[PDB]
Amino acid sequence: VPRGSHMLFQNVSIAGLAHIDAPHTLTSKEINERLQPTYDRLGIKTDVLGDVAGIHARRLWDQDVQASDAATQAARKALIDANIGIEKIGLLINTSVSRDYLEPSTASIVSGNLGVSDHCMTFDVANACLAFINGMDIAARMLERGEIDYALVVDGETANLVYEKTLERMTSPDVTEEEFRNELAALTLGCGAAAMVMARSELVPDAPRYKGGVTRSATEWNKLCRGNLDRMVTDTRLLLIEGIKLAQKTFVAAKQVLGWAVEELDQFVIHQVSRPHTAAFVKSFGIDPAKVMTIFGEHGNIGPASVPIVLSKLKELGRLKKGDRIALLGIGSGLNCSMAEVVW
Amino acid sequence: MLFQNVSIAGLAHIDAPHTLTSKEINERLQPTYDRLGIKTDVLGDVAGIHARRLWDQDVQASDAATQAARKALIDANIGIEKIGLLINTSVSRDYLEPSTASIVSGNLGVSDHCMTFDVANACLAFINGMDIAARMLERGEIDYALVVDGETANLVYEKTLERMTSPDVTEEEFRNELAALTLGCGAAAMVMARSELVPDAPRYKGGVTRSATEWNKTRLLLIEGIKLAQKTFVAAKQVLGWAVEELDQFVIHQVSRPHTAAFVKSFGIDPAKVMTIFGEHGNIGPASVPIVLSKLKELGRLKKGDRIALLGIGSGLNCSMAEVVW
């Protein structure tokens, strides 16, 4: 019985992948030292960062590193991984939450740094922690059609400023319990960068394939996590509850269009908000925790770069084998949920 | 290779309610003009911007985008439940996270199948959004899309006027800040759809993009932008079959009178085919193109079969040109 494609991508591949770890370690121990007088005033006796969220350290750049710089570093590395020159790139999309300016796009800045040709289409996509997958999909649609041969999706995140300003606000003798709780999640963020070269499959026959997938939304929850360059406010309790509800809905669609059954997937690359959010997600879908790589403990939450960083690390660690079915899953502020598949 | 089954179901624009005239602005800049001895009316007499519009206090980009979206849905005569994709393309944004699109979508009440995200690409983003939506429609992923764009400039005016008025500022710093006083508020939205759902609707053919990202760092913008546009037009001739005398309207990004005339001169375009709103509304960023297209529609200037060129030269530098057949 002939079936449809369900609109999954055909002949779109991952030619190259890379990540950059930011150089400076900031431990939760140091942060707690700074916060301790405020913890004490507020009666907080548990280590909410280390023991509850499960984050022991995160990485930071120098103050003067912009999103575009981190993105450029990852892009050069992914080009090497793909063994191609910048001249082959026909599309470059930046997907980071961090942004150099309102205008022009961070993508144009990265493109300028790398020296793209005058044929290269460039723009930014912004969608909280899901944007790298959005960028992959947009690239995939062009590649499938054959409008381009190769695309770069890039994402550099700089959390330096949010750390600096949040730590100042949270150490004020006047900070309220409500504002302290509201901003605490900002201290689980991390710096880092990732980039991916995608290509028409005919150019890279043995490369992993990207199939695309499904998305569902609950945009009535768009107030749950709001962030600017120096501040992020989060309702962690509702993010957890409403996020899981949305992912359940999304998983129903995934079973229908991707044919997913958790036991038949080899890796789950999940956006990571915290240890308890991850645990809840894994328990909710009955996923084998051994299939779920985490970097949150030592790098925290790298926003939309998280997924590709974890995928790149799995590649480098030699955890991925030909034929492996890899689920990319994320719940992003919006709320949105996306679930897609890569076949290694 | 061009899109065969993508149409424009509905289109709308919102004009911001408060007028700030350049005469009014100049009264405030006069002492600083005098100091440094300018004695020239750069806004009114050179740039050709005589007024621009501002929103009420505390109107966010999402609010303006939402107003435009509601009016575009009416123009398309469809309910929000039909929208499968909502992309926001504005420079102005409520937050870094979440997307301004999610906020607009929440305001409208989109369904749980509706995909949303922001695209940012200076003044070219609305055209990028249309392209992105077109590809999804063509592939059958969705039946209808909203592309929305609300621009706010209230804060920029307050801050810039105070800054450029301060003791430290050199000529040049000042002349650079003058450019900020050409920005205007406004909003637009477009419903795109699969053509079989809306026979007789205008059709979006798609377009071409060329870049010169070596210039991502005003007079310079002009020359290099036009050179980039020339390259892009050469491409448009080949892929779109474009020739100037065969196009009925040129809908272009709205930057300044000198910039517009230089563009018209370069391509040998009949200026009668180039509607402008900069004089009274200033530069509305990526919303300018769809606002002008919407005004052309509302004015009854567009007739069945009209070949309409949409184009912008954006910060990057980037240049995109696309065709709509009315």
Ligand SMILES: C/C=C/C/C=C/CCC(=O)[C@@H](O)CC(N)=O
């Ligand atoms: C398992 C439930 C998790 C809820 C997720 C909330 C969103 C996560 C964040 O707040 C950031 O990582 C980025 C983001 N919102 O996309």
Ligand SMILES: C/C=C/C/C=C/CCC(=O)[C@@H](O)CC(N)=O
């Ligand atoms: C006609 C030549 C145009 C040169 C380009 C000028 C830059 C224009 C602007 O500064 C804004 O309108 C928007 C933008 N840069 O995308």
